[PDB]
Amino acid sequence: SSQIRQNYSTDVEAAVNSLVNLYLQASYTYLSLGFYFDRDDVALEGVSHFFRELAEEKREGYERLLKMQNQRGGRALFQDIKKPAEDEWGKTPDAMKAAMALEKKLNQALLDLHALGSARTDPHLCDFLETHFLDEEVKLIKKMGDHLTNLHRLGGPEAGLGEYLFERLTLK
């Protein structure tokens, strides 16, 4: 089919399309989180801005995945981007838990894709995910673990005060 396609299996192409849809779902979930934390009755500009940046980073994710899909002579196959798991994300700890669960799911899908690249003997896929993704998600899951631990120390009956101090002093 493609003239440039070399050592790029149908499984890796399909798993890259599946991962693109997953980064689109994640970017859309971080869009939903990012605008939920900007609701007037949620009002956490730093938590909004944090997920607005994660929506951008997951977009740089699907865009660089699609750039690689094209560089490998794969076809970008676009499935429906399913709606985010919640329309109301609860408090900042609950949303940061959902964000971590999502990012650990993306990191799982990357690790599954890297395992598939290793099984299909695709060095360029392995390099590309190692270069742009596996360290990005590990740094970001660490960052959200730092956030979750701070949000947990800021828990208790004082959680409203703690949620505010988290947003004002950790989130820019």
Next chain:
Amino acid sequence: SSQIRQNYSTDVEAAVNSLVNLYLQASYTYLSLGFYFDRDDVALEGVSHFFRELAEEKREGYERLLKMQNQRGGRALFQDIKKPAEDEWGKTPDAMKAAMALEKKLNQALLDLHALGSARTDPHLCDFLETHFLDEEVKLIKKMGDHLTNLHRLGGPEAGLGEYLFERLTLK
């Protein structure tokens, strides 16, 4: 009658004078809030500065309305600027509620004036309110909703602590 006055009804002129008096009452209410929060027994330089800026923004409001009133060949019919509703504004949440109620009243008077401009077929009034006022009030009522939500999560038995964290970390 005025030589420049075109398509500018007596109702729109009178409702612009009524709205000018409302923005004057609003600046005067934000003057009262701004200096109430600078009282030694209230002592919130950031809440004071917030309402001091709103007194200025409502003053640009009545000044823009008076600029437009004169640009349309209307007459600026001034009236008593009635005293602000409270002599003492209570706590920062209570004051921010009175402020958001005042901006929702001003936004109602803009929306009523825009409905009157639509009924009297006055495009320039509609443009002027849309350009200079309706977005300013919607942004500001959003900003006050954000403040009220933060002041609400900062409520409970720690309310004195939360009230001053709100001031230093939001209003700076």
Next chain:
Amino acid sequence: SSQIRQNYSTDVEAAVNSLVNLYLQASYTYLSLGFYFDRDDVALEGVSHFFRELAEEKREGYERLLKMQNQRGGRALFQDIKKPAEDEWGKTPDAMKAAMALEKKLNQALLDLHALGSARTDPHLCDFLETHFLDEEVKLIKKMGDHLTNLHRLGGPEAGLGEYLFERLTLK
């Protein structure tokens, strides 16, 4: 209900959620187009870049609609972003024609939302769409009509030499 929400009907909120989903589908369709024109067997860097710009401008669109949805005390409700209607976009005229059809649909949904804002007497919605969207679409549908007229003018016994010169000299 929201504390800040004033003069913002459930119909306008729902039509803004519908238009957000439509601007999301539009950005995702421009993602499909943008990465389709970067396929090795399509290879039109300026047509890919043109639809990457439209994906970015439709992303500014749904993000700005969501910022407004929040500023009005509306709740952003997120639906599935339906798959982008094609994975194979034909030649540049076929794609530019699908893009202009999408943008005339998206401008229709804006004009319908503005008609709904006019019917619900919502000046701030009218202002917001007029300021940020109705001129965005008219400039962009004009630009795509200009592109389609040039692509049709460049239609011929090859089509592909004209299509290359379109990408090289208009989209550059």
Next chain:
Amino acid sequence: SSQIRQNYSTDVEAAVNSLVNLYLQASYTYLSLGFYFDRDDVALEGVSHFFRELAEEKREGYERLLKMQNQRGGRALFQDIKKPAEDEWGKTPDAMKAAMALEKKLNQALLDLHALGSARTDPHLCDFLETHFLDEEVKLIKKMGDHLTNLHRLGGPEAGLGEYLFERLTLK
């Protein structure tokens, strides 16, 4: 024997020498292409420049491989650089096909060497090829596929007009 040599098999050393000879043949083929497209009866200075830059990039390639061969305590063994496959490269599509086939052969030799490095458990070889070669060849085979697709759209009876417009507007 080398004092620094660690975890660097005789197969990987010999396959790095074989790959150096392929990058030397590739530079020599891009020298032949580069000077053929500057030939007076060919006269495509942008196509000549494109193959000169590829002769340089494949030289940066064998020089990196030789620097790495030395860093690993391997011995650079130099074989004859076989003559490049044609004296006459034909039209720009024919030459770009010979180039894209040559980069697919060079990328195959990288992938074979990476498979050998993985089989010999050589992480530094894998890192080195991933860092400096596998992405360079994938980007370059993509770039040549983009060139070929433009050169095919610029094909048909128009032929020489398309060959000129390719060189003038893609290879500026």
